[PDB]
Amino acid sequence: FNNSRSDTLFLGGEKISGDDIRNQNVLATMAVANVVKSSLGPVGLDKMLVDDIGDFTVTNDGATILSLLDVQHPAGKILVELAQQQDREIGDGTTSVVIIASELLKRANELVKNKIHPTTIITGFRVALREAIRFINEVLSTSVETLINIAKTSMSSKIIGADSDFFSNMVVDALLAVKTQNSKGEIKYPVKAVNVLKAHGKSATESLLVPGYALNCTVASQAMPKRIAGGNVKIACLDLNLQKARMAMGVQINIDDPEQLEQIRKREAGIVLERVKKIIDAGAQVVLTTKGIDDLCLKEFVEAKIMGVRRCKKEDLRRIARATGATLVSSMSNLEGEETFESSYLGLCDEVVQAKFSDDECILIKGTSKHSSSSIILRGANDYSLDEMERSLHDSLSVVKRTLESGNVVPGGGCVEAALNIYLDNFATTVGSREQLAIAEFAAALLIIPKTLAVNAAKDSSELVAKLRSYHAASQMAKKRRSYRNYGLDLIRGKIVDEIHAGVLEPTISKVKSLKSALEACVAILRIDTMITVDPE
Amino acid sequence: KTSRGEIIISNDGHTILKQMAILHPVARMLVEVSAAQDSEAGDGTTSV
Amino acid sequence: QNPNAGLFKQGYNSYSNADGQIIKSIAAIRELHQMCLTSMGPCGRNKIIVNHLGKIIITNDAATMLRELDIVHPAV
Amino acid sequence: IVVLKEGTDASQGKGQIISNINACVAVQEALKPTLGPLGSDILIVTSNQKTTISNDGATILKLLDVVHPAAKTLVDISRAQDAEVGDGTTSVTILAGELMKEAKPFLEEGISSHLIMKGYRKAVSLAVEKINELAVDITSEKSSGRELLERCARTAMSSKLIHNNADFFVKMCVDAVLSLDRNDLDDKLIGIKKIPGGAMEESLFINGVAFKKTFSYAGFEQQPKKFNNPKILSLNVELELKAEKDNAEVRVEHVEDYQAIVDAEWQLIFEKLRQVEETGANIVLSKLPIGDLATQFFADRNIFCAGRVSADDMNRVIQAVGGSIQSTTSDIKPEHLGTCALFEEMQIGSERYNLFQGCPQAKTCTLLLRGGAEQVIAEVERSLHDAIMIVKRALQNKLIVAGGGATEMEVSKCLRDYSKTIAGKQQMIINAFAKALEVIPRQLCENAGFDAIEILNKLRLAHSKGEKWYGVVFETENIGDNFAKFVWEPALVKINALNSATEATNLILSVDETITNKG
Amino acid sequence: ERTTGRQAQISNITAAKAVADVIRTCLGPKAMLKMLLDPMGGLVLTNDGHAILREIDVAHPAAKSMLELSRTQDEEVGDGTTTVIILAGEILAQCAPYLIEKNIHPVIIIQALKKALTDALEVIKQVSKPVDVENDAAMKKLIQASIGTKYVIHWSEKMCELALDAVKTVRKDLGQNFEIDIKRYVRVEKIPGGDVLDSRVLKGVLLNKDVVHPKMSRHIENPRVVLLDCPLEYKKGESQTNIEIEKEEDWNRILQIEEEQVQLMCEQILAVRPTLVITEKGVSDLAQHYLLKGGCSVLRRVKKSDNNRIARVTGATIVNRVEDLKESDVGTNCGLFKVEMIGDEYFSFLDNCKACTIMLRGGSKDILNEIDRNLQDAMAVARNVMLSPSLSPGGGATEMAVSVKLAEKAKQLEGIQQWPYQAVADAMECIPRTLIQNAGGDPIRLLSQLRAKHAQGNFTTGIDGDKGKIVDMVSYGIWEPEVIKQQSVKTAIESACLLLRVDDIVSGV
Ligand SMILES: Nc1ncnc2c1ncn2[C@@H]1O[C@H](COP(=O)(O)OP(=O)(O)O)[C@@H](O)[C@H]1O
Ligand SMILES: Nc1ncnc2c1ncn2[C@@H]1O[C@H](COP(=O)(O)OP(=O)(O)O)[C@@H](O)[C@H]1O
Ligand SMILES: Nc1ncnc2c1ncn2[C@@H]1O[C@H](COP(=O)(O)OP(=O)(O)O)[C@@H](O)[C@H]1O
Ligand code: BEF
Ligand code: BEF
Ligand code: BEF
Ligand code: BEF
Ligand code: BEF
Ligand SMILES: [Mg+2]
Ligand SMILES: [Mg+2]
Ligand SMILES: [Mg+2]
């Protein structure tokens, strides 16, 4: 064993052809997939990934495990970039889009060893998908709480899941409250709002859901108030900085007469000081600049008990302002003047307070005019668990933004897989030929999710996998009696149940893209028959 | 996988030969004839 | 910086039990226990031990595995 | 701070079992091409520097070194196959591996290995009986005594470098399994000899016995180099003046005694020497030397000789001219000697070869092999041992099965059909082994180019739907009755094969922790 | 490289268990001092758990998670540091068997532990009694409780005093919860020497900065304080301020202007008739002069933290630009301005004969850090009660109560779900045990009796430290903030739940 030599065709690098490379690819994808096949399902578990300094992170987000795990090799990166696509597209389904991909190559490859051209296998998988995508719309349905359910089942393989009921609720709640219309209709749920925060202390359950937003800052000078308004407040969402001006980059102050020295000088302080006044003089009780504040132009807010926060997160102010109806003041101008325009640009908020959280202490803008908004704040044992709590609070809360934007769900629990399996499997004879083996493989291959969903329970999973297999195989006999697919796995107990009833819901939009995608990879790799690796520099 | 580390996949001959790292001189010649197959027809770079 | 006391013998390693040693040992034993715990019974499995002179060996028996291994922990 | 093994690797887990399987697969896929009539061949240049080229799967798997415990069993079962049988060595491994391959799905899905082990266990039992059940015993059932040994040494000599010169060698092969007593077939008698040069078929079948030319002494060139019915004296020891070895001390105080003891030495030899002459022999051979003076003597009186004959040679010499080794020259009686039909000293391939050809009373032949390279002669000798050894085990068991995938394909049938009646775990496992047998027909087609998929699948119909000997028409690529086409192999192969192959397969599926010690 | 399977699990458990093992002999009234050596140089002779584990770098991931537990806990309550570590370990350890021995999946053991936590927390609030956060005597004998087990006990009473006398001082209810920022308003100040008792809680601040000019007031009776950001020297232009002169007698002109602006500045300050001007930045020699005859003493360079605490015990709100210097920015409500010279090192005081400055004295710069930390624990449990007037049965009593009410319930639950639940109960028991051990008495003996007496006869029955016999808490009392018993069990069960989620460990960024 071991490929080698060259003889003719002098090439500045490595080059494997046929069997040799074609297997290498399959091995590659295989390994990168197998690392995260033990994180699949509720019975699946997280892992710790230590660096060189010794620090680490524990996480089940397949996409971050494959990101965090240094992968060197095309077909390896491919499935790490494909695991990426998911987390970037829908937001959950990563761990699974890879396990599928790997399974398609691994399998398809076997067909080639049997002497079956790659293309004939490719078209075969292509048709198995056409039929499979269509059929996927024959298990799904319109939203008919489906929400607190979607948000829950998406926390099974996660840390946040021991307290499913709690967060499953806080998730939908928080998201919903932020909805908007983008432009011309839409009604999209902010694919990123709800500033999430975390602080070590108290229970996992004691995670608060602010009734507004959580801007993470103090209050400039400790001299100003730490809590303002009980009834109504005017919030100044700025952007321009209130510090001592410096004039044009090319504006030399050339003095010819010692007179002008002192004058123009102290003028500098006032120029950006007037700007301060024209803002306090608007009813501004709360100021949120983005580009920081002077300590001089701060005392002005202090002397006036105006909660004024320095250099804020501009990604928050943009949302702190849509939430108090205010205006992100780029620079007081309008036509040709200068003012933050009394309450014209200001925002209406119920109350601005600086709540503490042991060690930390941040500001809260809870209750507002047009806010609707929310923001969650995790509390855990330490950063190690906390990063992950959120990590999967997101991989969960994302499943919701898509169930919403796309009113359509399918029963997970490895049901979808089983169904497609037996359907495509029987459908496989509708073309016979060599091509049969293709679809057949495709279908058969899908049973990876149900098998591995269960094997992650140690017990002889050949049980469920067999039962669930049979069921659908039967159900599609008058698919008539009382047709009952939607039968998934209940690993916690070890039996086949109706997941739609049980509460195991997953958005169609996931398993529809998770599938169309994973094959798009498998094919571009199925075509690989020679890998020329140039020598670097 | 180029010298730079960028990965590529294709059936277009002129592009495989181009990025292949052919070393022999008269061998490099082939890449140029496939180059010109692209410059006139735009197709058949593999066949030429 | 840290000093060091009461030493006049040669370069040994004394594991006083008043240092939770009994358990350090339970550990070492605990490790080789799992090897035998799956070799017993008809449902037992074999292990391929490869000699320190390089010879293959496969056996369900326990006294043989242990024999062919390079054990070192005194409590083991 | 303490330890328990001193830095000495050892893996365990479920992956451990999977590693081992795949490991074996490698060593397996390695030989897959050397299978079938149109089978590929290998060229191994071991770290030794000796370059070899062959197909005896055993010989290949012996040159691969291989150290992986698991994968190393495939090397063992391949060796045994070249023992208890002599042929099929290539295949015992293809299967042995293939099973381990089909065990992966279960082991992965999360099934006990003890269950897969049981499943395969029955599968073999059933499959083994089925072969015994088809082992067409014959004798004159339109087969004849020679046409069985020929028809079987032929098909088995196929797919070897010795192929297109088949007829020549099968007629040669059978003739040499018969050369020895059919009551006790001992290979050690068919002693082969290799001669540098010549056509890979300009090889010669000596009827009596042929051997080197150890004749390393002066005074030769005299002594006829050819006799018709000579009186062979298969002597065992010495024939030198001062003796080749052993001594004592001679102490004398008299000048005359000196010259006396001398004249004695001489006469001491000459006597023993004439003692041989007295036997009235024409050919005097000895596993020990025949000094200058000695060989010189016989040379004078037209008696031929040779000293220091190969030990394993004199024994074939006896069995040829029917002599009988003699250690001393004294009690040499005449039923001790031997005589052939013809003796000559050839110049085959630029090398003189003493050979006692023609011996209707022999129980041991010898055969010289030719070739344009020390690799081809070498491959012939191994391509021929695989045949001779199959002819031999076809006398002792006139039971034969039609291979070419048929036997293999059929044993699948009954095994797959049986699994229907079982249902469940044992169903899949026993039904797996059934499919796993398809590797021989499968591979056999890919190696040659035939449509592996269609030819296989088309075979499954007809074979299961009747024709219990349908295999593969090496000729018009298509299925066919290999028994009718005369593709015969003793059942003794397949039966040993599936027994011994599975052994490996469960030996591996039984190991959960591999502890390699370093040192 | 990689370690999947029980392999992983085990090393995690053992790791976590070992973390405990180190400081277990630091939990108890007879707790020993772990003198640790820091890399930077000096040493740490403390026995305060978190302060130890901080000074020990660890490797195994779990040992890292286990170590940070002591931190998040030292952030909620100031106390109960060592306890959380020991519990957090024993929980994982007590699961070890049912985790692999009884082959219970990590999901199930987690589902139970999260459940057993809540029930367990009930039993804590169930045995907790409330307390008069205002009753000076109760607060003292409360603060005193968490001062034992520390070098600072030989002055226990003296400590709770400086504790309360400071918690309450920086406190400021506010309602429209109670806000006590011990951190920014109770700047400590460790001064080598004297006696312990020779330390007081000055109601003001203490800076060692002297006076800007010799002939300047060493102490103004009732000073008028003026705190400011900006420096006291000729400023410059934040643009390309470049002067070109060829007009001879113009050099003198500009060079003079500088003196002139320093004058103006002194005016604006002098205006509100001040006696004490403390600036965070510098003080031009000129400005000193005009503030000298202007009638006031000056203090240059003082930290923001130092300054903003002054502005709470002088009322003098700090102001930047002087041409805006209001008169509301007074210096009212501020006693003297002493400038005691403490052993060749001048100081300055600002007591009034909202923020105090605890000034400790002991017997070394080294010994003081013992006190400071010890004190922090006192001053923190005081704050806890201030924001949660509930207390728990000390002497490990509470810990045993939860052991039974849980043990009982577990035994009466039935299902594999019972074993993990049972362990939480068995686990809890370790604290009264570590106590009894570090006491010297027989663990198997005292516990069986403590546990039994608990099972029926009251739940406020823990173990007595220096004694080693089981005593009733109410009796000699040693309740601790109920808040501590919250966290200790909240995060400990969490920690366990996290690490149990691990079945694989890998190395590389
Ligand atoms: N409650 C459940 N019972 C059975 N299966 C579930 C349940 N919760 C999620 N699943 C299934 O587990 C898989 C998702 O788990 P996970 O490992 O998190 O994949 P991903 O990380 O890709 O979301 C899907 O098959 C989903 O249908
Ligand atoms: N003439 C043939 N036609 C079809 N199959 C044959 C023929 N000759 C041998 N075979 C088959 O080829 C396989 C033997 O392969 P070979 O290369 O001879 O290695 P070995 O005999 O050592 O296994 C067996 O299946 C045998 O039945
Ligand atoms: N006076 C004492 N007698 C018996 N137990 C005590 C006494 N003082 C502290 N305890 C108990 O020991 C623990 C406090 O010990 P300590 O060494 O202070 O650890 P921590 O750093 O967690 O405070 C608590 O369980 C408390 O109930
Ligand atoms: F880990 Be998965 F993406 F929910
Ligand atoms: F490959 Be060719 F250029 F289409
Ligand atoms: F049967 Be035991 F392993 F000796
Ligand atoms: F290669 Be086998 F022995 F015919
Ligand atoms: F001992 Be603890 F930190 F008060
Ligand atoms: Mg998920
Ligand atoms: Mg053969
Ligand atoms: Mg304490």
Set E46, E79, E81, E461: catalytic member: E81
For C37, C61, C62, E324, the CA distances from C40, given in Å and listed in that order, are 6, 7, 8, 90
Q: Ligand 8: does its nearest atom lie under 6 Å from the Cβ of E49?
A: yes
C20 Cα to chain E: minimum distance (Å)? 9
Is E48 an active-site residue?
A: yes
Phi-psi sector, D422: left (phi>0), alpha (psi -120 to 50), beta = alpha
Question: Going along A194-264, which residue ranges are E strands?
Answer: 197-198, 208-210, 212-215, 227-228, 233-237, 253-255
Nearest to E78 by CA among E375, E305, E390: E375
- Residues D198, D218, single domain; the answer is no
D296-to-D214, D299, D332, E71 alpha-carbon distances in Å: 16, 5, 22, 107
Q: Give distance in angstroms: CA of A157 to centre of ligand 9.
A: 6
Residue A112 contacts D where some CB pair is shorter than 8 Å: no
Residues ≥6 apart with Cβ < 8 Å to E42? none
Q: Give dist(CA E275, CA E254) in Å, integer.
A: 31
Instruction: Determine whether the interchain pair C45/D3 forms a contact, defined as Cβ–Cβ distance below 8 Å.
Output: no
Host domain of residue D270: 210-395
Judge contact between A400 and A175, C-beta under 8 A: yes
B26 touches A: beta carbon within 8 Å: no
Q: What 8-state DSSP symbol labels residue A344? A: I
Please indicate, yes or no, whether residues D260 and D192 belong to a single structural domain of this protein.
no
Distance of CA A19 to the CA centre of its chain: 38
D389 and D277 in one domain? yes
Beta strands in E15-107 (DSSP E): 36-37, 43-44
Instruction: Give how far Cα A469 sits from Cα of A369, A486, D102, Å.
Output: 55, 12, 20
d(CA E259, CA E281): 18
Strands D209-210 and D352-357: antiparallel
Resolution (A): 3.8
Q: Which of A14, A82, A528, A533 to mutate to test the interface with B (most CBs of B within 10 A)?
A: A533
Query: Cβ of B9 and A534 within 8 Å?
Result: no
Q: Can you tell me the distance from the alpha carbon of D355 to that of D362, in angstroms, rounded to the nearest whole number?
A: 14
Is the alpha carbon torsion for D177, D180, D183, D185 positive or negative?
negative
Cα–Cα nearest to E379, from E371, E368, E391: E371
User: D and C: touch, per 3+ CB pairs < 8 A?
Assistant: yes
Q: Are residues D157 and D200 in the same domain?
A: yes
Of E14, E21, E37, the CB nearest to C1: E37
Per-residue burial over A397-409, b if 16 or more Cβ lie within 10 Å, else e, is bbbbbbbbeeebb
Fold adopted by A144-210+372-407: GROEL; domain 2 (3.30.260)
For residue C25, the chain D residue with the least C-alpha distance is D2
Instruction: Quickly count: other Cβ atoms within 10 Å of residue A203's Cβ.
Output: 21
**What CA–CA distance (Å, rounded) separates D420 from D406?**
22
3-state secondary structure string, D1-32?
CCCCCCCCCCEECHHHHHHHHHHHHHHHHHHH
Gap from D118 CA to chain A (nearest CA, Å)? 16
Same structural domain for residues D318 and D391? yes
A10 to chain B, closest Cα gap in Å: 5
What does the domain layout of chain A look like in residue ranges?
A: 1-143+408-537, 144-210+372-407, 211-371
Q: 3-state class of A534 per DSSP?
A: strand
Query: Residue A487 and residue A500: Cα distance in Å, rounded?
Result: 8
* Distance in Å, alpha carbon of C55 to nearest chain E alpha carbon: 27
Q: Side chain identity at E326, as an amino acid letter?
A: K
Strands D226-227 and D342-347: antiparallel
Is D234 in the same domain as D194? no
* Identity of residue E374: N
**CA E149 to centroid of ligand 8, rounded, Å:** 8
**Distance from C-alpha of E336 to C-alpha of E329, rounded to nearest angstrom:** 18
Stated as kind and residue range, the H or E segment containing D216 is none
Distance from C-alpha of A352 to C-alpha of A228, rounded to nearest angstrom:
5
Indicate which residue of A29, A57, A94, A324 is catalytic. A94
CA distance A461 to chain D (A): 6
The dihedral region occupied by D138, where left means phi > 0, alpha psi between -120 and 50, and beta the remainder, is beta
- Residue B38 alpha carbon, nearest atom of ligand 5: 3
DSSP code of E324?
G
Q: Which residue does chain E place closest to A356, by CA atoms?
A: E179
d(CA E30, CA D348): 104
Same domain, D215 and D182: no
The answer, yes or no, to whether any atom of ligand 3 lies below 6 A from the CB of E432, is no
* Beta-carbon separation of D453 and A114 below 8 A: yes
D57 Cβ closer than 6 Å to some ligand 7 atom: yes
Answer whether A454 touches D (CB < 8 Å).
Answer: yes
Where is E170: in which H helix or E strand?
helix E156-170
Nearest chain D residue to C73 by CA distance is D4
Shortest-distance Cα residue to atom 6 of ligand 3:
E395
According to DSSP, the residues that pair with A507 across neighbouring strands are A409
Spatial separation of the C-alpha atoms in residues A33 and A107, rounded to whole Å: 14
Give yes or no for A277 touching E (CB within 8 A): no
CB contact under 8 A, D106 and A454: no
CA-nearest of A244, A190, A193 to A214 is: A193
Those residues whose C-beta lies under 8 Å from the C-beta of residue A228, and which sit 6 or more positions away, are A285, A286, A305, A307, A351, A352, A353
Q: Inter-chain contact D519–C58, Cβ cutoff 8 Å? A: no
Q: Is A465's CB within 8 Å of D26's CB? A: no
> A459 touching D, CB under 8 A?
yes
The nearest alpha carbon in chain C to D8 belongs to: C70
Same structural domain for residues D202 and D222?
no
DSSP D71-122: HHHHHHHHHHIIIIISS-HHHHHHHHHHHHHHHHHHHHHT--HHHHHHHHHH
Joined tokens for residue D16: 């451990």
Strand-pair category, A233-237 with A286-288:
parallel
Q: Which fold has domain A1-143+408-537?
A: GROEL; domain 1 (1.10.560)
Phi, psi of A536 (to 5 degrees): -80, -170
**Catalytic: which of E351, E377, E464, E472?**
E377
Token pair of D116 as six digits: 């897969």
Spatial distance between the Cα atoms of D41 and D54, rounded to a whole number of angstroms: 6
Candidate from A96, A164, A391 with most ligand 1 atoms within 8 A of CB, to mutate: A96
Pairwise CA distance, residues D318 & D315, whole Å: 5
Ligand 9 center–CA A408 separation, angstroms? 17
In a shared domain, residues D190 and D148: yes
Name the strand (E) or helix (H) holding E182. helix E182-185
CB A5 within 8 A of CB A515: no
Alpha-helical runs (H) found in A178-229: none
User: For chain E, how far is it from start to end, CA to CA, in angstroms?
Assistant: 12
**Which of the residues A153, A395, A452, A508 is marked catalytic?**
A395
Looking up tokens 């039994």, which residue turns up? Answer: E452
Residue numbers after which chain C is interrupted (C to N above 2.5 A) read none
Q: Residue A528: its chain B contacts at CB < 8 A?
A: 9
Verify whether the Cβ–Cβ distance E257 to A262 is below 8 Å.
yes
Helices (H), E272-358: 285-292, 304-310
- Structure tokens belonging to residue D489: 């192999």
Q: Indicate whether D173 and D220 sit together in one domain.
A: no
Distance (angstroms) between ligand 9 centre and the Cα of A146 equals: 16
Rounded to a whole number of angstroms, the distance from the CA of C74 to the nearest CA of chain D is: 9
Collect all residues with Cβ–Cβ distance below 8 Å to A187 and sequence separation of at least 6.
A179, A180, A181
Residues touching ligand 2 (Cβ under 6 Å) are D 34-37, 39, 55, 57, 87-91, 155, 158-159, 403-405, 440, 444, 472, 474, 487, 489
Contact A261 E76 (CB under 8 A): no
Are residue D323 and residue D353 in the same domain, yes or no? yes
Residue that the structure tokens 């992650």 belong to: A456
Task: In whole angstroms, give the CA distance from residue E60 to residue D350.
Answer: 76
Q: What is the gyration radius of the CA atoms in chain D, in angstroms?
A: 29
| Residue E134 buriedness (CB in 10 A; 0-12 / 13-18 / 19+) | exposed
CATH code where residue D143 lies: 3.30.260.10
Task: Please tell me the residue having the least CA distance from ligand 6 atom 3.
Answer: C61
Residue-wise DSSP of A424-485? HHHHGGGT-TTHHHHHHHHHHHHTHHHHHHHHTTSS-TTTHHHHHHHHHHHHTT--------
Q: Indicate which residue's Cα is closest to atom 17 of ligand 1.
A: A40
C vs D, Cβ pairs < 8 A, gives: 72
Chains touching chain B through at least 3 C-beta pairs below 8 angstroms are A
Cα separation, E166 vs A223, in Å, equals: 21
Angle at E136 between CA E135 and CA E138, to 5 degrees: 65
Are D154 and D243 in the same domain? no
